[PDB]
Amino acid sequence: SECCELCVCQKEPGTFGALIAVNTITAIILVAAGAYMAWKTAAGLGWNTRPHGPEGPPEENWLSPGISILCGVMYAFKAIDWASYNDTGESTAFSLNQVWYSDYLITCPLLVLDFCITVNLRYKLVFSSSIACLLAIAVSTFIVDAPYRYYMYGIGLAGFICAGYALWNEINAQREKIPDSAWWYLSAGRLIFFAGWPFFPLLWTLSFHTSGVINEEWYFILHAILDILCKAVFGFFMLGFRLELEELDFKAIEAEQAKLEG
Amino acid sequence: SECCELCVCQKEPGTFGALIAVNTITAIILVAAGAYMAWKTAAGLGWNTRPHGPEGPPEENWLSPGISILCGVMYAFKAIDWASYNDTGESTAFSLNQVWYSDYLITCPLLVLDFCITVNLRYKLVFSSSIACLLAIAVSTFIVDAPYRYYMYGIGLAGFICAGYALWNEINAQREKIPDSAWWYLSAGRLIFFAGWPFFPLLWTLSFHTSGVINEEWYFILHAILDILCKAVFGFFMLGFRLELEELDFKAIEAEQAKLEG
Amino acid sequence: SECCELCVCQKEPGTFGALIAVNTITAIILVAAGAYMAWKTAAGLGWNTRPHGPEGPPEENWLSPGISILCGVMYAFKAIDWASYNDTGESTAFSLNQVWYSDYLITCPLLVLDFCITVNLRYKLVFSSSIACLLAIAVSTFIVDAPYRYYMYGIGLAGFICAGYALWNEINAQREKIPDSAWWYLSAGRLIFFAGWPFFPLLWTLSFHTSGVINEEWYFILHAILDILCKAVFGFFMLGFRLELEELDFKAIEAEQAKLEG
Numbered sequence: 001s002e003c004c005e006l007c008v009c010q011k012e013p014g015t016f017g018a019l020i021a022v023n024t025i026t027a028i029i030l031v032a033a034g035a036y037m038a039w040k041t042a043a044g045l046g047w048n049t050r051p052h053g054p055e056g057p058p059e060e061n062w063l064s065p066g067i068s069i070l071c072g073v074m075y076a077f078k079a080i081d082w083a084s085y086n087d088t089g090e091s092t093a094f095s096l097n098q099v100w101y102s103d104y105l106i107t108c109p110l111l112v113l114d115f116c117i118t119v120n121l122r123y124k125l126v127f128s129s130s131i132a133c134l135l136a137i138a139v140s141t142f143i144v145d146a147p148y149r150y151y152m153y154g155i156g157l158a159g160f161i162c163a164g165y166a167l168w169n170e171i172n173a174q175r176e177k178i179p180d181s182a183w184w185y186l187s188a189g190r191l192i193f194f195a196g197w198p199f200f201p202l203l204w205t206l207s208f209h210t211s212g213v214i215n216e217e218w219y220f221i222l223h224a225i226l227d228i229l230c231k232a233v234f235g236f237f238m239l240g241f242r243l244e245l246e247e248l249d250f251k252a253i254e255a256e257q258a259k260l261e262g
Numbered sequence: 263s264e265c266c267e268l269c270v271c272q273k274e275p276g277t278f279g280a281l282i283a284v285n286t287i288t289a290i291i292l293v294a295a296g297a298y299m300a301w302k303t304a305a306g307l308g309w310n311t312r313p314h315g316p317e318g319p320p321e322e323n324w325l326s327p328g329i330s331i332l333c334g335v336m337y338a339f340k341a342i343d344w345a346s347y348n349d350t351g352e353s354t355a356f357s358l359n360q361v362w363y364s365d366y367l368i369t370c371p372l373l374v375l376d377f378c379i380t381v382n383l384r385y386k387l388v389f390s391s392s393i394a395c396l397l398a399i400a401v402s403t404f405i406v407d408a409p410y411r412y413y414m415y416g417i418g419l420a421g422f423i424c425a426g427y428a429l430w431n432e433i434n435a436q437r438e439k440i441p442d443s444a445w446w447y448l449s450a451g452r453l454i455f456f457a458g459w460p461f462f463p464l465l466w467t468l469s470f471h472t473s474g475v476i477n478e479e480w481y482f483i484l485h486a487i488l489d490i491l492c493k494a495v496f497g498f499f500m501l502g503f504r505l506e507l508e509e510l511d512f513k514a515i516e517a518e519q520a521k522l523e524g
Numbered sequence: 525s526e527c528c529e530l531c532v533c534q535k536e537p538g539t540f541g542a543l544i545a546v547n548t549i550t551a552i553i554l555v556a557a558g559a560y561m562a563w564k565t566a567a568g569l570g571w572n573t574r575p576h577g578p579e580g581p582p583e584e585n586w587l588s589p590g591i592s593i594l595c596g597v598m599y600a601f602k603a604i605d606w607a608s609y610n611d612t613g614e615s616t617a618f619s620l621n622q623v624w625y626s627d628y629l630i631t632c633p634l635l636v637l638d639f640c641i642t643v644n645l646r647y648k649l650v651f652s653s654s655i656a657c658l659l660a661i662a663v664s665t666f667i668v669d670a671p672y673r674y675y676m677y678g679i680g681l682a683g684f685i686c687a688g689y690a691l692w693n694e695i696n697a698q699r700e701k702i703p704d705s706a707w708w709y710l711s712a713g714r715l716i717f718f719a720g721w722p723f724f725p726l727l728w729t730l731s732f733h734t735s736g737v738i739n740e741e742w743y744f745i746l747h748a749i750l751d752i753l754c755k756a757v758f759g760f761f762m763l764g765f766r767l768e769l770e771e772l773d774f775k776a777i778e779a780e781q782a783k784l785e786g
């Protein structure tokens with residue numbers, strides 16, 4: 001039928017509790033992580049919350065909490081949607097669970113931008129737009145029928161590997177500048193970027209529409225954990241990196257000022 | 263049926279004259295207001311149209327006329343759409359009247375940005391993106407079915423109140439800088455922002471889909487007046503503010519130059 | 525029926541080879557042109573590929589290759605879509621051939637921006653957003669029914685003529701600055717802009733939905749050539765302009781430095 005054997009549209013009303021629970025929990029996690037990040041950025045500069053200043057926190061210091069909070073709002077909307085599936089058995093009109101990877105568009109162009117701004121990686125906009133385009137091909141690979149979904153997957157994967165290589169090069173060409181104390185958080189966010197991301201593309205090969213190992217319910221459940229790790233946990237490592245940099249900057253400024261007085 | 267009792271889809275062909283008229287009138291108003299604003303910005307700097315310069319009017323001086331003109335084009339498209347409902351009785355393919363608050367997305371992210379640029383309010387992009395996201399929840403609250411539209415409304419209203427509080431704080435933390443002559447126009451645009459906006463959210467509670475006091479025809483008619491007051495009249499007050507600032511700046515420059523010669 | 529007499533939906537499975545071929549060829553052309561442009565921008569500054577520097581190529585030097593490559597990816601997706609029409613006889617779920625001029629949105633706001641950045645034309649964002657809005661009216665004129673498609677066409681054409689006039693003025697008010705060596709490429713990209721663009725609007729008058737001279741198959745075939753000329757060939761002239769400017773800049777810097785040493 002319209003709903004494939006392994007879809008959430010074949011599940012009966014009353015059997016969606018797991019999905020609502022997972023999505024509410026992730027909404028809370030993402031929103032609260034983003035709120036901690038927001039508090040940390042507002043409260044102060046470095047690890048010891050040094051008073052910001054007249055201009056306040058930079059506007060890019062809000063990109064990171066921003067994504068986490070927005071993804072949490074998205075997940076709350078998804079859980080509201082899943083609750084309609086539990087009752088009416090037929091979703092909402094505004095379902096963020098209908099189009100797969102449609103929310104990942106926004107989130108990704110915002111995260112790659114974050115990384116590229118914080119680490120001062122070059123071609124910030126280039127990278128961010130490339131990822132938006134590769135995550136538009138991702139949506140397509142879920143909608144487009146069999147033979148052509150694999151052709152589209154090929155294009156998307158080629159570009160993903162190309163952009164990944166270029167990104168790797170950029171981070172490794174900024175390693176010299178990045179202090180060793182701040183590199184821990186960077187390498188952790190990179191690890192999240194090079195392992196965690198390829199996971200999204202490989203889970204495709206075992207998905208409900210491709211193979212059929214993971215049914216749509218469980219695919220959705222797994223993409224929630226992956227979002228906690230991207231979005232939320234990526235931002236906590238990037239927040240850490242930022243704070244380390246800002247504490248080291250405070251230290252450097254204070255030392256420069258000591259030498260200025262002396 | 264698909265069309266609720268109090269909808270424009272239940273109205274017979276030939277009974278849409280009022281809607282076409284209102285929407286054409288508002289199109290004219292918004293476009294002409296934006297054109298006056300455009301002329302004023304191009305012609306000169308302050309109230310006495312002081313010759314601009316080599317670079318010309320700043321690109322942000324076009325955000326304000328821009329929105330008004332675009333909303334007027336939107337309303338012209340809406341009136342064309344309403345004319346098809348008057349004749350064919352079944353709308354156009356490209357109807358800006360189908361999805362409610364879908365046009366408000368663009369207009370709002372552009373207006374909050376305007377305010378934040380002109381008054382130099384901090385977190386410009388943050389505020390503008392927050393409003394875009396809260397006006398995406400607004401569209402949802404019109405499409406999503408009963409129980410879940412109120413859950414979504416709750417999220418949207420929470421964020422609206424949060425962003426409103428934050429905005430209020432920002433404007434009041436910039437009051438010291440803003441000259442008293444320019445504050446008149448600011449307080450008027452703020453009044454339009456804190457009263458006029460909450461009106462949009464409260465009319466929801468009495469709308470065709472929520473309660474049923476205001477049928478979709480009249481809801482549409484009221485949202486046209488509200489757009490004249492937001493968009494058009496908001497920009498005339500903001501244009502006024504800008505011009506006041508620019509005239510005071512011209513005065514300050516001329517005084518500084520007199521002291522430079524002396 | 526839903527498909528008009530002169531549409532690609534009336535063509536039988538197996539008769540789409542021409543469309544696939546044209547769209548694959550254009551995909552290759554656009555991608556390869558954009559890749560040459562990308563190589564040229566990365567490799568060096570001017571015509572003689574002068575080593576760039578620490579910061580590398582400006583982020584706007586990627587807007588031009590970018591569009592060409594993205595339009596090539598779009599056309600590859602279109603050819604994949606056309607192959608489904610050749611086999612299944614009913615398109616893909618993600619068809620870039622469904623909505624007419626929907627891809628032109630992105631491409632156009634990116635190209636006008638390019639021109640305005642490279643030639644330092646004023647009102648860059650204004651122009652780019654105007655074109656995005658006029659190319660949203662373009663999509664409408666393909667979907668909206670008879671009487672109202674001509675009303676929308678009128679609005680779109682009025683704005684197109686207005687923006688065209690304003691653009692002409694801007695380029696002619698920057699002619700004095702632009703060196704004569706670089707003007708060749710500029711006038712060629714302008715020629716592509718003032719002739720080539722009006723072609724898009726005039727082909728509308730003879731299209732499958734308006735008149736019926738050009739059926740949708742051949743309209744699609746012609747819009748592919750027009751994209752090679754816009755996108756691809758526009759960027760090769762703009763790449764040329766950029767390179768000329770950069771070689772002249774290198775020359776000027778080297779002369780200034782000779783005088784600095786002397």
Ligand SMILES: *C/C=C(C)/C=C/C=C(C)/C=C/C1=C(C)CCCC1(C)C
Binds near residue numbers: 160201
């Ligand atoms: C926070 C959101 C994330 C990390 C989403 C990432 C999405 C991708 C890395 C998409 C990957 C792809 C697919 C699974 C579909 C098409 C092929 C790829 C590789 C672009």
Ligand SMILES: *C/C=C(C)/C=C/C=C(C)/C=C/C1=C(C)CCCC1(C)C
Binds near residue numbers: 464466
């Ligand atoms: C110029 C356009 C304007 C002023 C539109 C504003 C729209 C809102 C303030 C939306 C308000 C909300 C709803 C009516 C729906 C969801 C809840 C709110 C408060 C976000």
Ligand SMILES: *C/C=C(C)/C=C/C=C(C)/C=C/C1=C(C)CCCC1(C)C
Binds near residue numbers: 663680
């Ligand atoms: C690279 C993409 C290009 C050059 C697309 C350009 C599209 C236009 C110039 C659209 C023109 C118009 C229509 C054919 C429909 C509505 C009326 C116009 C003039 C805006």
Ligand SMILES: [K+]
Binds near residue numbers: 044045
């Ligand atoms: K901070």
Ligand SMILES: [K+]
Binds near residue numbers: 061117
């Ligand atoms: K950042």
Ligand SMILES: [K+]
Binds near residue numbers: 103104107
């Ligand atoms: K998300």
Ligand SMILES: [K+]
Binds near residue numbers: 096097099100101102
């Ligand atoms: K989804």
Ligand SMILES: [K+]
Binds near residue numbers: 064067230
């Ligand atoms: K994050």
Ligand SMILES: [K+]
Binds near residue numbers: 303306307308323508
């Ligand atoms: K002005």
Ligand SMILES: [K+]
Binds near residue numbers: 323325377
């Ligand atoms: K402004």
Ligand SMILES: [K+]
Binds near residue numbers: 333365366
């Ligand atoms: K509007």
Ligand SMILES: [K+]
Binds near residue numbers: 361362
């Ligand atoms: K509407």
Ligand SMILES: [K+]
Binds near residue numbers: 327330492496497
């Ligand atoms: K306005």
Ligand SMILES: [K+]
Binds near residue numbers: 566569570
């Ligand atoms: K270059």
Ligand SMILES: [K+]
Binds near residue numbers: 586588639641
């Ligand atoms: K450029």
Ligand SMILES: [K+]
Binds near residue numbers: 628631
């Ligand atoms: K294209």
